[PDB]
Symmetry: C5
Subunit: 241 residues, 5 copies
């Protein structure tokens, strides 16, 4: 068992994000096989119901380098691998190349904890999304330089309390998840957002752009991937025609 | 309901720039199929009359990584997506690859407003383009560094008052629009120009290269895209033979 | 009416260089349709007698990302577009991809002009190429940084006077034309050289690598394109077997 | 003769890491020939029993730019070349492109030797991996700037003494191997790791991110390759379906 | 008349290195035509006995972006071009893509001459390559920043005296050639080496990395190409099976 509620909430969980882009020779796959494609993916996800949690998102028309992308959660990285491997054997899998992959792992809080920063940590854990279900997904890999990592845990804590201050407000607006990747893939972190209000999301990024921590970023995007939230079959249903 | 003159004037409007490149195997779609590509597009635009505003520019012969590009404006990014997704299902859509996409959103004035900078804002608002209808479009994404963003509002406004001083004069020549992207795509801004005088346009950028604000650009083109303005069908008619 | 001696001499003249690479399936065009491809380019050039000036250079064998490139000069960028657009409809045109395009425009002298720098300006106009018909062309795109442009025109003039002092002597040896690109493409300038002496030309760059101006280059080649000068019909003829 | 236990333990051994990516026309190799592909690699590996040591890793589903990768060890680079060259003629070989290659060579200890740092060396040599056979491999190419190389051996020793201090403890968890590359390929080192505990691997990197040495990396990944450990024929069997 | 001993030794000699990578559809050229492709290259090289000097190296299995590469020496770049151009029409030629090209020219000594640095000129010119016919080739493009070029000749001399010192001991071990490129291509230098001791070569490069001059490299590799020495026909025979 892998309950969506729990797995998204616990440490030690692997995320594997994989951006795929359909090849042109998918248009020539017979309108028939293509329309059977969504069901095949749906079935695959059920098969791996107990090994990994699957999310699928539609970026076609909004992104140069992906038509759609998966988020995979697993307690076992090898299991994430197995699912993705089987996905690429599927009809759609066979007609799309991979354009990006980010591997990450969930960890406990490093800075804004009950021990280290009790005040902000309360604001954090007792904050709650309000309003329309989010339609938009944003995924943003982040890497910081040696200079940041060479700061004292005390100095980086103060920087991260600065990060947390103007941003708590946006938790009514925007959902967030943080994955950790240093040494696992070419990025320090993989950040995941769901929102309905992009203008708000824009203001949120500017907020964080304007603080000292931004000064240490060497990757903060590239790609910034913003696509649209749907059920797995519905994403494949949209790629069909 | 979407009137051209309204949506290009209002805040909260999503811009979706998408630069397309036709594959070779388009010169092998028969002349006849190719020539009816233009009506297909024309009919897609009328179909989305009320969802999006569509602009289409010829870049073939002027740009390495596009033959053409769209500008879509929308009150709903999701509707920009759908239109784009449906354009890529079009005869022309099926024989072209995407090579760049820029997402952005219109905002109110940040710096040169009636409150913050009355003198220049007057100058800006009360100035109107003169002479021959623009033949050329230019689209330039811009990203400023963490250092720019960590300067105070007062420091940043001074720098934008500098940007605006030498440029106001060029509004008799050049038309402009400013989209905002931080956190939504890999760029801070997407700028849009229409002019008939490219020599002017050159003198305009040099005016800007020459000031302090240019010191914080980490992206200021790449790609700088200059193409030629036509009606949507006229762009596809041109791409056909 | 467009006369080579006049258009290459006047300000406000648009330059469009475009580097093409032949696709593997060009060897599969029956040889002779290939050889008669040259007549087709010849006819296109005469057809546009009145619209653009055309040059064609062979780079196959000397460059990674081109077999050949055009130089177009026009009074109307639009007409250069049409020309190129019509070349890509050509038989050769249908078997080559574009790998680079540089757009620029001719301007009056900025620094080394009769008023500003009387002595060098005289040396410049009254200097005259000797020795053999140049065999080689070099095209170098150049971009300078915000720091250069943020120097006052006095400081930059001094620097351009420094550029011009060791270089006048190379005018017997080497032929130059300077196009201007800021805001029109992803470079500050396009530089164009014809020489027969490649050792001399290397000595020329090093002279210029060793002055303060070089400190401000963020692009100075990339690609440095050195190819071989011929008539248009001869370059296609060469590309044929 | 080449024995695993020895060649992995000695200086002067050439490492050749090659990352391959299967092309889409491999799913069109007949299920028959594809299933026969594994035994063919298995026999190729036996045929070179006495020439090179072969490792083969599975990255499909965890990596954009590879599906599988080899680690060859040889006393003779030529021989590692011949094996690879012969692998590429294999059924799988003829269906994959190379996306990365790293050539390195083993050397005696430069810093934490018995002579120079006896304290840490005792800890490094008498430390022993515990618990589960490693399911994951990580390969990281690392290159340090001119600044690092221009520090004195005393200063660089101090910094490697700093590298070793937090890391020795991960030797119960993580297996390491260091190859050297300056002058031979585009990196200063190739590091190789095997571990079962990716969370522990992440913390190990963060340990090292946080010390002064990290300040001199110009390459530390790019790519970071993390795949999954199996027998040569199993990797291929997994690529087949 | 071109003798290998003279042309490799004289100033004013053009070097053209060209890295090819074989396209997958070469494996589908009839085995027969592939075996015949070697004699073809051999006859073409005879054909240009007197136009160029040709060397050809095997990189398949050791390099991502080449299977083979040519070194052409000519007294006339245009003849190098014809040669390469005729090679690309050859059977193998028609099945490979160009992945790198470097054009360079041989010059007299700039620093460690008899006039300017007598002592070291002696060292250099007196010790001679001993040791086994070299199995390995290395080719490294090198480009130095504007800071370097702006140092006085006296300062750069002092730097190159420090380069030369540690290298003197590898005179028995490693063969070198230096071409100059500034202004002719996108590098300052192309360096060429033949050796049988890769460990030694690694130690030589580390010695050079550790001197001040390494501080001014902006390109010193990328690619670093290391491959294997054979007769041209043997190289193409190597690519056949
Ligand atoms: C607006 C709502 C947000 C809140 C309440 C928030 C809160 C936090 C907190 C409390 C931490 C520290 C957690 C820990 O170390 O255990 C953190 C870390 C982080 N956040 Fe956010 N954040 C928000 C939005 C964002 C955005 C828009 C980004 C940009 C992608 C972002 C990027 C990051 C990154 C990269 C880290 C890890 C920094 C490090 O490695 O030390 N967050 N965030
Ligand atoms: C001559 C015509 C131009 C005029 C009158 C003009 C005016 C302005 C004004 C008044 C602003 C401030 C808007 C605000 O904060 O609300 C602005 C912002 C901006 N402009 Fe222009 N501009 C012109 C040409 C250009 C050009 C050629 C570029 C180059 C792409 C450019 C790029 C930008 C960017 C990137 C911003 C936003 C800066 C920021 O985020 O703080 N503008 N412009
Ligand atoms: C040896 C023959 C050369 C001569 C006589 C020469 C002369 C000049 C002169 C007089 C100017 C100023 C023109 C003006 O501002 O209106 C100029 C500008 C320039 N030259 Fe050359 N030059 C020569 C070679 C080169 C070479 C080898 C390069 C390298 C690409 C080069 C690159 C440039 C660039 C980029 C500019 C414009 C600088 C700016 O934008 O302010 N020139 N040259
Ligand atoms: C936790 C287990 C590790 C231990 C016990 C360890 C230990 C060492 C030691 C003792 C040396 C000096 C060897 C010598 O000079 O002869 C060394 C060098 C090196 N290590 Fe590690 N290391 C570990 C993990 C890592 C990791 C995670 C990396 C990151 C890729 C790494 C990268 C390197 C590199 C690039 C060098 C060469 C430094 C140089 O060129 O001077 N090591 N390591
Ligand atoms: C190991 C045997 C080597 C010897 C005996 C040697 C010797 C020299 C000498 C004497 C010069 C000055 C030539 C002149 O100014 O005319 C020179 C220049 C140069 N060497 Fe080597 N070198 C060796 C190895 C290397 C290596 C491994 C590299 C790196 C690939 C290298 C790269 C260069 C470069 C880029 C220059 C040009 C310096 C400049 O442009 O000012 N050399 N070398
Ligand atoms: O720190 N929000 O991923
Ligand atoms: O600031 N003109 O987009
Ligand atoms: O300044 N010669 O382009
Ligand atoms: O020092 N571990 O490669
Ligand atoms: O400095 N030897 O190319
Ligand atoms: Ca990776
Ligand atoms: Ca994006
Ligand atoms: Ca452009
Ligand atoms: Ca290499
Ligand atoms: Ca070149």
């Amino acid at each position: 068992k892998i309950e969506r509620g729990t797995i998204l909430t616990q440490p030690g969980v692997f995320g594997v994000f994989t951006m795929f882009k359909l090849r042109p020779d998918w248009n020539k796959v017979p309108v028939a096989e293509r329309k059977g494609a969504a069901e095949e993916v749906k079935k695959l996800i059920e098969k791996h119901k107990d090994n990994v949690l699957v999310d699928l998102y539609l970026t076609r028309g909004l992104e140069t380098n992906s038509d759609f992308f998966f988020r995979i959660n697993a307690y076992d990285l090898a299991k994430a691998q197995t699912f993705m491997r089987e996905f690429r054997s599927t009809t759609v899998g066979k007609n799309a190349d991979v354009f990006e992959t980010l591997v990450g792992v969930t960890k406990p809080l490093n800075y804004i904890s009950k021990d280290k920063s009790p005040g902000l940590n309360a604001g954090l854990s007792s904050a709650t999304y309000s309003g329309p279900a989010p339609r938009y997904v944003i995924v943003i890999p982040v890497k910081k330089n040696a200079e940041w990592w060479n700061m004292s845990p005390e100095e980086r804590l103060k920087e991260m309390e600065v990060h947390t201050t103007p941003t708590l407000a946006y938790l009514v607006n925007v959902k967030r998840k943080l994955y950790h990747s240093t040494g696992l893939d070419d990025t320090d972190f993989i950040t995941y957002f769901e929102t309905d209000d992009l203008t708000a999301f824009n203001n949120l990024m500017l907020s964080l752009a304007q603080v000292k921590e931004n000064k240490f970023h060497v990757r903060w995007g590239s790609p910034t991937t913003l696509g649209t939230i749907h059920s797995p079959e519905d994403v494949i249903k949209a790629l069909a025609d």
